[PDB]
Amino acid sequence: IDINDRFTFSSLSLNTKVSVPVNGNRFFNKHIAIVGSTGSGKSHTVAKILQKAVDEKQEGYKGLNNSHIIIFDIHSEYENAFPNSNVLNVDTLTLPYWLLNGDELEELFLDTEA
């Protein structure tokens, strides 16, 4: 990996001094699949990758970078990992029903069993 495209969020298991970079150019645009069991730490791995993707900058400016990450947080756990983020629960989200398509609008209102 080139030094500009290097993205480090982990180190080698058998050698903690060896940083393991990924091609962060190619790490994100192609889709990522983080798989493990419950209690393996995949919520921590997701959080650590996104923290590393947020604090990093081009160094020519001061402020927020251009990362845009949307988390479908269902266990109410990523509030702590990103304290300076925008969190939207039911009491704050306003999702318009009219932006739903015909397929979504059928499930919201009809019953399908009868």
Ligand X SMILES: Nc1ncnc2c1ncn2[C@@H]1O[C@H](COP(=O)(O)OP(=O)(O)O)[C@@H](O)[C@H]1O
Q: At 64, list the tokens.
A: 């927020």
Q: Which of 48, 85, 52, 55 is closest to 70 using CA atoms?
A: 85
Under rule CB under 5 A, which residues in 46-105 are in contact with Mg ion? Answer: none
Stretch that binds Mg ion, among 9-17, 43-51, 87-95, 100-108 (CB under 5 A): 43-51
The residue within the footprint of ligand X, chosen from 23, 42, 79, 106 (CB under 6 A), is: 42
Name the binder of 56 from Mg ion, ligand X, none, CB < 5-8 A by kind. none
| Helix, strand, coil share (%) of the chain residues, nearest 5 | 30, 10, 60
* Interacting residues of 65 by C-beta distance below 8 A, sequence separation 6+: 54, 56, 57, 58
* 43 scored as a contact of Mg ion (CB under 5 A): yes
**Three-state DSSP class for 50?**
helix
Binding track over 7-36 against ligand X, x by CB under 6 A: -----------------------------x
Which residues contact ligand X (rule: CB under 6 A)? 36, 38-44
